[PDB]
Design a protein around this ligand. Structure first.
Ligand SMILES: [Ca+2]
Ligand SMILES: [Ca+2]
Ligand SMILES: [Ca+2]
Ligand SMILES: [Ca+2]
Ligand SMILES: [Ca+2]
Ligand SMILES: [Ca+2]
Ligand SMILES: [Ca+2]
Ligand SMILES: [Ca+2]
Ligand SMILES: [Ca+2]
Ligand SMILES: [Ca+2]
Lengths: 213, 213
């Protein structure tokens, strides 16, 4: 049967609402009046009324902002009923895809990560790993594409930058010499995860590194 | 059957071309590849190729500017053929309505209208009528709504404005006294017709009035 292509609608649209999505029609409307209705999640089942249809014109409308991270896709069915009460079409499946906006900051899997490193560790030695996730669309956008950086180190001794981080993997490695358990046994790093390949929304967490013998 | 509402497209659209009108789909495309085609005047019969369809996506497109005054409406039919060669849908009728722009000046039915009036005619006496037409859309717009005015009178004696015109009907009447065949036997009026209720595109013609005894 001839049907409508999937409709795309972005999340977080600003008003006014409602907004038109598509106008549908039954050509049985040349035989008399036809009334249009829609069913399905987002229509007549929870969340009810997010989408509505104009009963005489066939204009399908969205009534409020969408959220791809709550519902990314809707399946509705349109119905066409004669003024005399009989269904004049088999219901038509209508697909609505919510497209992404960058509206979730990355979030570290926990607030504090801990690690240890031996004081004689060669420069280049992997120490620990920090990890963040991003609830945005990683298939179609860079809105969930996380880069990792170090914002600070405490103490800043013997050097300000004892460590470096892999911007893609969140692996923290020793980058210089002079670790000394008997002097500075613990380093606290503030680390950042930022989406859009480092350029977007961001969050921070802490990496606490113990220097061992 | 579920079908597409009539599509509106304005005449005289600027490019680039082609431009999308509607995307169609057969849900038989879940059984295998479906190829889309369109027939009808403006598609595969004269004027050929004004509308085209993308064979795999189903995007129906217009390829050049339209002219409501040459063709105001098109009836096309879409077809859906399997990759194996069989028609998988009954063809669907698609209606395209060209909407108007004000792109025709009014035109007087002839360049010179003639008339006569008796020298003793009472002020208010109807003399003659001038008529213009406008090829634009008089049903849906003011693009064919003509107002008539007088631009000049020769001679300007005994008064500059011996006559007036009815702005809606183009009827010219005597508005003052002093007509005199033995002095000024002939008046030449330049008259104007302008659409958008007098405010739009315009043309002129001449009304030549003979004063009789
Ligand atoms: Ca969201
Ligand atoms: Ca999002
Ligand atoms: Ca994000
Ligand atoms: Ca030591
Ligand atoms: Ca030691
Ligand atoms: Ca035209
Ligand atoms: Ca026109
Ligand atoms: Ca006009
Ligand atoms: Ca006289
Ligand atoms: Ca006389």
């Amino acid at each position: 049967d001839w049907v409508i292509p999937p409709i795309s609608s972005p999340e977080n649209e600003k008003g006014p609402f409602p907004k038109n999505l598509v106008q549908i029609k039954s050509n049985k409307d040349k035989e008399g009046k036809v009334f249009y209705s829609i069913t399905g999640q987002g229509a007549d089942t929870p969340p009810v009324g997010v989408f509505i249809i104009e009963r005489e014109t066939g204009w399908l409308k969205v009534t409020e902002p969408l959220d791809r991270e709550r519902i990314a896709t809707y399946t509705l069915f349109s119905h066409a009923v004669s003024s005399n009460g009989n269904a004049v079409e088999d219901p038509m499946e209508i697909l609505i895809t919510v497209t992404d906006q960058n509206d979730n900051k990355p979030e570290f899997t926990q607030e504090v990560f801990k690690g240890s490193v031996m004081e004689g560790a060669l420069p280049g030695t992997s120490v620990m790993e920090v990890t963040a996730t991003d609830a945005d669309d990683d298939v179609n956008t860079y809105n969930a594409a996380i880069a990792y950086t170090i914002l600070s180190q405490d103490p800043e001794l013997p050097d300000k930058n004892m460590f470096t981080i892999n911007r893609n993997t969140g692996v923290i490695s020793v980058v210089t010499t002079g670790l000394d358990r008997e002097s500075f046994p613990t380093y606290t790093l503030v680390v950042q995860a930022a989406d859009l390949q480092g350029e977007g929304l961001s969050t921070t967490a802490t990496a606490v590194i113990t220097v061992t013998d």
